[PDB]
Amino acid sequence: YFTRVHKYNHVPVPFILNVGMSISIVTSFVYFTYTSLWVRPEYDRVVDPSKAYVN
Amino acid sequence: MEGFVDKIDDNKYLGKWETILTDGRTHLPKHITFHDAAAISARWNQQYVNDSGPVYYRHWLACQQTYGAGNEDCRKLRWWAQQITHPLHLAEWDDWWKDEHYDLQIGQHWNRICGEEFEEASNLLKDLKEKREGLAAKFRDLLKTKTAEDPMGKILHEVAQLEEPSKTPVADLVEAGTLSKEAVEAAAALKIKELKALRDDATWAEVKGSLLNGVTTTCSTLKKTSKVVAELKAQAELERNKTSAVKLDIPHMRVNYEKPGLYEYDTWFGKFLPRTPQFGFA
Ligand SMILES: CCCCCCCCCCCC(=O)OC[C@H](COP(=O)([O-])O)OC(=O)CCCCCCCCCCC
């Protein structure tokens, strides 16, 4: 008997756990991607042609 | 540059004013990108830059073999080669260059000449250089001794050997007893009479008549040679992409008074340079 085929041992996920896990993972990915790629302020450029100096 | 005298060619004097003028407090540029530096950094844009030094050194070699190390374009190329070439390669290639390895006529670099023939030719050439330099040194010493005899020569000689580069050198000399008001006045009288003669119509006409022939002949020659230079340039341009090799364009780069780069800014248009034989100095 093949007891690991798709027709056997399906455990539905409780709704509360499903909602919590989905929200947690979505929030984690969104926050990390935001702070890693969108909240990078040390890449600051100041455009000012009047700060040059020539003798 | 109030007290800077350009006619003076004393290495010590030029060094003092190099220290004064190229000081970093006033000469360092802020937020400036030089086109020459950018182009050199864009052609060889990786960390591995073993390939720039040989190319620029060979550019300088060709330039100074055609025109001599005293040419301003050659000096520019030498300055760049020194900047971008590591001192190990520079040392080895300067040792070879000192041995007539890069000579255009008998150097093994450009010719398929055997070791013994190259050796004898290089020895002859180096001995010739030694003798000519000895004669030139004697002539330079004799001319420098004679120069001090003249009024202006004496004043310039005393200015050159001043301990510190001052803004008002003649005033400091005359206020310290080194120079005499009488000698200064005599030199000024000589200069005034020369100036009056130059702007006098009759004497200027005499001078023009005396010097007209040579100038006219030179103009005729260098207007005739223009066409042939163009024909040679075109014929060589046919070789630009003939093969996979790269053709030389002696001089690679010249001193640009209209669009100065990093060399002109750092050396004040080729005025403050290392005083070594590679720059055409003794
Ligand atoms: C030791 C293991 C650590 C590695 C983490 C692996 C976590 C895997 C949890 C997966 C739960 C699951 O069975 O997903 C199926 C459900 C859909 O329910 P159904 O179709 O099976 O009824 O789909 C859902 O319920 C959606 C939730 C899926 C979010 C992913 C898990 C978040 C937890 C991250 C932990 C670091």
Omega prior to B251 cis, within 30 of 0: yes
Residue in chain B closest to A50 (alpha carbons) equals B31
Cα dihedral B144, B148, B149, B151 sign: positive
Spatial distance between the Cα atoms of B209 and B78, rounded to a whole number of angstroms: 42
**How many residues are given for chain B?**
282
Method used experimentally = cryo-EM
Spatial distance between the Cα atoms of B154 and B231, rounded to a whole number of angstroms: 51
Q: What is the DSSP letter of A38?
A: T
Residue B181's identity, in one-letter code, is: K
User: How remote is the C-alpha of B145 from its chain's centroid?
Assistant: 24
**Do the chains contact at A55 and B31, CB–CB below 8 Å?**
no
Quick one: which of B259, B257, B239 has its CA closest to B249?
B239
User: From the candidates B1, B25, B31, which should be mutated to test the interface with A, based on the most A CB atoms within 10 A?
Assistant: B31
Map chain B to HEC letters. CCCCCCCCCCHHHHHHHHHHHCCHHHHCCECCCCHHHHHHHHHCCCCCCCCHHHHHHHHHHHHHHHHCCCCHHHHHHHHHHHHHCCHHHHHHHHHHHHCCCCCCCCCCCCCCCCHHHHHHHHHHHHHHHHHHHHHHHHHHHHHHHHHCCCHHHHHHHHHHCCCCCCCCHHHHHHCCCCCCHHHHHHHHHHHHHHHHHHHCHHHHHHHHHHHHHHHHHHHHHHHHHHHHHHHHHHHHHCCCCCCCCCCCCCCCCCCCCCCCCHHHHHHCCCCCCCCCHHHCCC
Q: What is the residue with the minimal CA distance to atom 23 of ligand 1?
A: A18
Which residues are within 8 A (CB) of B169 and not within 5 positions of it... i.e. 6 or more apart? B3, B5, B159, B162
Spatial distance between the Cα atoms of B68 and B128, rounded to a whole number of angstroms: 16
Quick one: which of B147, B129, B127 has its CA closest to B139?
B147
Three-state DSSP state, A53? strand
Whether B61 contacts B67, CB under 8 Å: no
- Min Cα distance A51 → chain B (Å) is 7
The CA-based diameter of chain B, rounded to the nearest angstrom, is 71
Which residues are within 8 A (CB) of A49 and not within 5 positions of it... i.e. 6 or more apart? none
Phi, psi of B30 (to 5 degrees): -105, 130
Ligand 1 pocket check for A22: Cβ under 6 Å: yes
Spatial distance between the Cα atoms of A5 and B63, rounded to a whole number of angstroms: 82
Residue in chain B closest to A49 (alpha carbons) equals B31
Place of tokens 């301003």: B72
Which residues of chain B have a CB within 8 Å of the CB of A52? 29-32
Ligand 1 pocket check for A12: Cβ under 6 Å: yes
Q: How far is the CA of A17 from the centre of ligand 1 (A)?
A: 9
Q: How many CB pairs under 8 A join A and B?
A: 17
Token pair, residue A29, equals 């990915």
- Other Cβ atoms less than 10 A from the Cβ of B142: the count is 10
Q: What is the DSSP letter of A49?
A: T
